[PDB]
Design a protein around this ligand. Structure first.
Ligand SMILES: Cc1ccc(-n2nc(C(=O)N3CCN(C)CC3)nc2-c2ccc3c(c2)N(C2CCCC2)[C@H](C)C(=O)N3C)c(C)c1
Length: 122
């Protein structure tokens, strides 16, 4: 398993905006409780899953556990940067798997809810 993405970085400039607080308070925390959220709450554990292929395919891994910690640590400059991590998470899933796979269906459901919630930001 590779090291998970960084959640703090003393040399990177940080910011806290209304949009970012909303991404944590509303967008992430509602997505988290969704019945299909559990696969995406931590990095893919390829060792546990016996998927030595996953990290051969996915070069920029991302997950909501990481995003959560990054929001909690004020790691982001703006909302858009955080939104890019959500979209990287979803697109990783669609790259690695095939349409109709159970995990893809799960990601699809979360992505629509995600898009619905970010449609209007503070
Ligand atoms: C349908 C399904 C949903 C989730 C999971 N599990 N289970 C754990 C686990 O070992 N966990 C998670 C929950 N926790 C409580 C115990 C540890 N991890 C995942 C998991 C997380 C993320 C992904 C995948 C699996 N798959 C795919 C791998 C083949 C099938 C789909 C690929 C990597 C995909 O791209 N991503 C995003 C499984 C076995 C089947």
């Amino acid at each position: 398993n590779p090291p998970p993405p960084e959640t703090s970085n003393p040399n990177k400039p940080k910011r806290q905006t209304n949009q970012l607080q909303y991404l944590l308070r509303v967008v992430l925390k509602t997505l988290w409780k969704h019945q299909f959220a559990w696969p995406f709450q931590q990095p893919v554990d390829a060792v546990k899953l016996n998927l030595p292929d996953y990290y051969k395919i996915i070069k920029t891994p991302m997950d909501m556990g990481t995003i959560k910690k990054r929001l909690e640590n004020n790691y982001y400059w703006n909302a858009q940067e955080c939104i890019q991590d959500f979209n990287t998470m979803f697109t990783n899933c669609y790259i690695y798997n095939k349409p109709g796979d159970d995990i893809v269906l799960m990601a699809e459901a979360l992505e629509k809810l995600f898009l619905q919630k970010i449609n209007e930001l503070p």
